[model samples]
Target chain A: QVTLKESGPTLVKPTQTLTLTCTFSGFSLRTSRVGVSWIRQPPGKALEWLAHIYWDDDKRYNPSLKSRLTISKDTSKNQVVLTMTNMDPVDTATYYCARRGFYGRKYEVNHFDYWGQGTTVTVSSASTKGPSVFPLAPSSKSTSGGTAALGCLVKDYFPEPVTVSWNSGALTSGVHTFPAVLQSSGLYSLSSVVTVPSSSLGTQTYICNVNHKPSNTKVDKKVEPKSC
Target chain B: DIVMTQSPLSLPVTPGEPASISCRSSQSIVHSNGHTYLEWYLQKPGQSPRLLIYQVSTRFSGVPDRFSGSGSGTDFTLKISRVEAEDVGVYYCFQASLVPLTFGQGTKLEIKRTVAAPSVFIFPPSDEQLKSGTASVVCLLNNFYPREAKVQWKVDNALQSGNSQESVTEQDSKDSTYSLSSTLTLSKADYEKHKVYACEVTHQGLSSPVTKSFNRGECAAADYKDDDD
Candidate 1:
């Protein structure tokens, strides 16, 4: 029954501190049953656990980020705050607030079961330019039943707001679109998975088309379909 | 800091068969406080990792009874009673009793082609019982295929003759696998004097007996018993 929303500055300069707040509802900060934690995903990369603060106020951190990160709570406002100093381009990513259910003889176990929609952060200098569309490797997986799922990754773009479309002999059925996401270097990237009938294999060509709104540019890449 | 490593970097399993994965920690995961902080996790492709077991052998809420964790100190194992297609993923072991928590490199479990073994889980006595006057310890054996695994108890490492005071075995309807539970009663004096108890399970799928041991102080009564609290 708990819900969380994250708020923070979308843009930050290198060497500056980045701070974010997670405002929560339906849960009390005074409860001893739930713990709050933070996780982040760099653009087009895997996710990382940043740090966590227990209901008892005990904090555990990722060793790599321990020196630069500080997590605190404002019980009066039902909020959890994250502050990281000496920011670098590598710190650019989407930060999410999550809730964990802790249990055990001493309540030492940490399990995250609920998470908030992430907030993207960008760290860059004023002169930093928009990213050029870098097409990613396209791959497909086929089920024994003969249905093929095609995936295309569109990477290395910048400045909030971009769109990606998939075309295989015109928009076929089951074209899944994933929205643009921020990357580690403060650029944008995303992927799309398209499902096609096995009968179309070897006879169709799939295309990934990207439109960068900020730069008013468009890029397209093609992948020839093969038997699953 | 403790390092965790899982073997068979990748395992190809078949449905209805048994699968065993090993996780070893550089140092004993047992804390000075007597609690072992080893846990097991499964990360399905495109999804977040889910906790399968915690504190060595306690199944996390909602985890299927098919998955069980067993081990002590530096060596541990996660055994799946009957492999299911939905069980495919990367398995990891995490140590939490020390600073700078660590995770195993991860063992991938997938369907390809794949033992009926019992996964032993021993529960320690409650703190309230230890302090009051008596205690009862429980040992559970899950997914022993063919329903033919035996359980043995040892107090302070000394084998106790005879079957457990109370034992029951049940068959799983969906998978036709078997699970067993046994309880042992000890007086307050015995609990105070005997510091360790071990549960040993022997099954056809095991090359040798699989054992799980715990100290009297490791599984004390909890401040809160369930999430509803």
Candidate 2:
């Protein structure tokens, strides 16, 4: 089965909509023939189905999530995305992705079966900086001292044997060791960074890639070194 | 919807030993009255159930000092101070305050090898607490992974109280440990030993009575606690 893990902002301010990610690697997102379903388990209640998105097609949502659901997919790799609006603290729950139809037929219309453990997004009016998102590209702009840092949280990863690396042409850097901070949702999100020495810019381009746990599927992102 | 589950169905303890019963719901038990609705009950071999607590933490009046309960939403526990010879029976955790009447599978307390005492007999609640209208009792089960527990109220020795829009709660577990509380509102005048208010829990593969209390005190206690909550 395709195991999934949701990683996103741990805390948020009120009214500030959040964009959480459900990253996967066991099965082919473009070939699973099934979509990824999103569900929330509130603080003290049961699981509440949110919506679902197919990498090759459209989207579906629970009736209650109709006006507040957005689903997107990046099949080129394997990350199903979800976003909800109308921020409220009551909306907080550990989001997950799992095999469909496990919650019984009544919920197959929208409920998640094989789930992604879940990532919790707490709603608050206060602002805080968690993991920063940055775009990566390869360009030889004459500059000095440039490096790119990327991190992958490792809390509850099923079927171990996963590897992370930084590459530039023929050179590959060893894994970056870091501990992920555990959230209430039971998943861990850790960070890693790749250094491009100030004098090493002219050597080659750098790419951060992760091998699917216990598998060979690879997801690579080109990091544009900034001369800061 | 709070779902409650128990790993094992039985626990063996010798007399004078302490035993614990866990009652976990999918959600928290704090009611709209801002009170936790968790109660402990016991089913002696072939008898009905007895109430040990209501809204958690609190010991039901007249309940022996042997029974005690503690814990927050989604993670609660009931401990028998010292297992008495009469304490051998089935223990259950019930969350009538939540949806679906969730209950932990009954845990049978069996007597290990031969014990000293002749035969320890445990008596349940008095008829006064089992009659409806004459008094009323609320039972709570907390620490549920899914707050889905069904509820039914009995009067005196008979089931009398029916549904009437009791306050219910959900959606607080994932964000934080939460609670759900249910109240069976009735007057003492309506209570009869022939009538009792029993709150049972049915969920998943488990179905058992979590609490059965007779009516005692005045009808005013309901409104008074309601306002306090």
Candidate 3:
């Protein structure tokens, strides 16, 4: 199995170049004969394939970006690099590196198979507002005679790495956090669940808190036992 | 880029029955390499989409044989032999012959709880009417589900072009099921000597067509004149 990871600068000024690196492991770049490609999605927009580079230095690119984009591979480093010039606000997107399959031999290109975790880029001013956070009502389900499972949903947040926490009154429980999922509109949605005892429902209040470090914003929602 | 359009926006499918959907492309999807890049996909609720057919007619790996694709150039078809409950979802057609691949507007297929096959009845012209002038026959299809079905007329096993046909659809208020009736008029002399006027009804609920035939000379005079007066 092959694994890929993408790293790039998070901030770029307008008209400046943006560079992204995709490092791979567990596969020989020369003998594997696989294809590497770059795909990006503008915030809240459909995904676009920038270009593809084969093992033998063969390359193909999106007609629109043929002039400003260059995709290259380094065999020693097992990495693929993407450089885009004359960047603008429209270039603000999460760039991903994907592995394309070979058709029959290496003569034709097929579809993408594996993808790397995307790295986001922002081309905005310092005053730009981060994503607005909205916390939905919390839900509790009785799992046993005295214990219950509590869930929290946080929606509509932008940028990377939002922290979600659950506050259970009077007692401590294990917290299970799910990774943030990108919505079709390019925002993020995440959910976290905590287990609590049902006996503490009427006596203690529960709360869900979301913290965004970059935006310096914190939003929380208190859950009523009856609503759960 | 080849644009694809699907028909009927939605379909109500029943298990154990066959279903067909059409996809028409704006231009031929045949590539310069003599291959067509038309593909079909199914997107179940809340799940990532899966490819069912590719290269116009080849089923993808692990795709069931029941799901088949056929067609060339501007017109293509995707057919499912037996729809399962798990098959409820939206179906899409994608054309990859050109850069910036395009997808057709999805057609949602819902699972229908129950469906009824059509009952066909044909009314042939009587002896007196054939003696006086040309004859007219009407084919009636009643009590079907899913709202859509096909009607065809045949004389002595050969297909015939029907004239002056009208179809009316009705819904059962209680169950929300549909029923439709179609009537076809024909000339009496076409099947005058030793003939059978056949009405073939094809519904999605049936594996075979339901056919009803009316012999030209076997009908009573009252059967033909009753509706005329």
Candidate 4:
């Protein structure tokens, strides 16, 4: 039986460096083989696995945050410390410490067997940035004579509120906008999809229009079916 | 295109013990750059295969030290210093040095455990067979491991030949146990005159040789054609 708790700053400025600590008892980090990993969750978003470090010091991380994240253990005290640079509003999340999966096989991507009470962090920003949009991608199911779909990934935005619409030779049907996802770089990503009839695929083009009060856009992203 | 083949298709390993698998290529996979372009992977339960070793011997990023790879050219070896209980699954070797590289048929890693006792069965000839003037008796041994069980057929306590048996033990899907079946054919007249046929199985799990015999009219055969036939 192991017990874990986490502590960190609840408020910080954008582009600031953040450090969080997880102190555990009932097991020795030097004697036991179990590893510890960090998880992140933005307000009203899905949980994300940040990275993990073993008792022996080997580590595997989510490549998305490899540029700004590092984890190390404080051997003198039974604690795991997570440090990341350039915290942003999109990186605003509650951070929790968790135990890795059982058996200590390095590649197993262990299950999170235990969890620590989370520490919430909020980044202060003036809503200064607009989103970066990518070219539309055709779904694998897009084919001739069958239904088709297109996706638009809009990321690196601030202030949470945005509108996404689709146009396929006209206003499109079956438009689905997913909740904003938190990014490791302290930013947000919003994904939207539109389904179209197979007859329009390859012959017609679909455009994704994103609207944000903080940022203005003059051009929209478009995609042509890239399918068989 | 290089074809990859892994040996010891079924490996029985014990936890806290070492395990190894061998892979041979149909052709040399070494590129002019001196890299073998060969890699090893392990597909654990309910997950896709993850890379363990690359370029023949170098451990992939984050792979445990307990797992290692060696060899070059057309042969390669993947070994674990000490296998773990969570290591049960399949191991595969892949090549991409050439235009149409290949993957070895995976080797399944099984944890060596106690085998269930063998099940013995003897099936007598059917009325249809007696109507055809010949009786076919079947002897089956099921759910045994290690493949060392011996089998024999006898008539009236005397040894007999001309019996047929399965060449390979059919492996069970749920576990590592295996089964084998054999048959003996005799004329209806010989069976009635002898009146006794025995299937003897000798296995380590058994205290002694166990014999199951079938006698004339031993089976209640009222449902089929006349028993006289």
Pairs in steric clash, model 1: A43-A183, A157-A188, B127-B221
Q: How much does candidate 4 score in TM-score? A: 0.36
Model 4 in CAPRI terms: which quality? incorrect
Candidate 4: where are CA atoms >4 Å away?
A: A1-228, B1-12, B24-28, B31-75, B80-96, B99-111, B131-134, B170-174, B187-192, B220-229
The prediction achieving the highest DockQ against the true structure is: 1
The better candidate by TM-score, 2 or 4, is 4
Cα-based RMSD of the predictions, in order? 26.1, 28.3, 23.6, 27.7
TM-scores, each model vs. reference = 0.52, 0.30, 0.48, 0.36
Return the lDDT, model 4, position B93. Answer: 83
Give the distance in Å from residue B170's predicted Cα in candidate 2 to where it truly belongs.
19
Docking class of 1: incorrect
Please give the TM-score that candidate 1 achieves against the real structure: 0.52
Model 4: how far residue B177 lies from native, Å: 1.9
What TM-score between 0 and 1 does chain B of candidate 2 receive?
Answer: 0.48
Residue-wise C-alpha lDDT for candidate 4, range B59-125, written one tens digit per residue? 8667889999998899899999997756667788866565433567778887675656666655565
DockQ value for model 1:
0.03
Error of 1 at A104 (Å): 8.9
CAPRI-style class, candidate 3? incorrect
Per-residue C-alpha lDDT of model 2 across residues B15-112, encoded as one tens digit per residue: 67888877777777666656566656665421234566656677766788988888877888888878775666566665644333345666766544
Q: Is candidate 1 or candidate 3 better by TM-score?
A: 1
Mark the regions of model 3 whose C-alpha exceeds 4 Å error after superposition. Answer: A2-17, A21-26, A39-49, A86-98, A103-112, A115-157, A160-228, B1-25, B39-52, B62-67, B77-94, B100-229
Residue-by-residue lDDT tens digits, candidate 3, A123-187: 75433235443222212212333545444445456556566766633233345444556554465
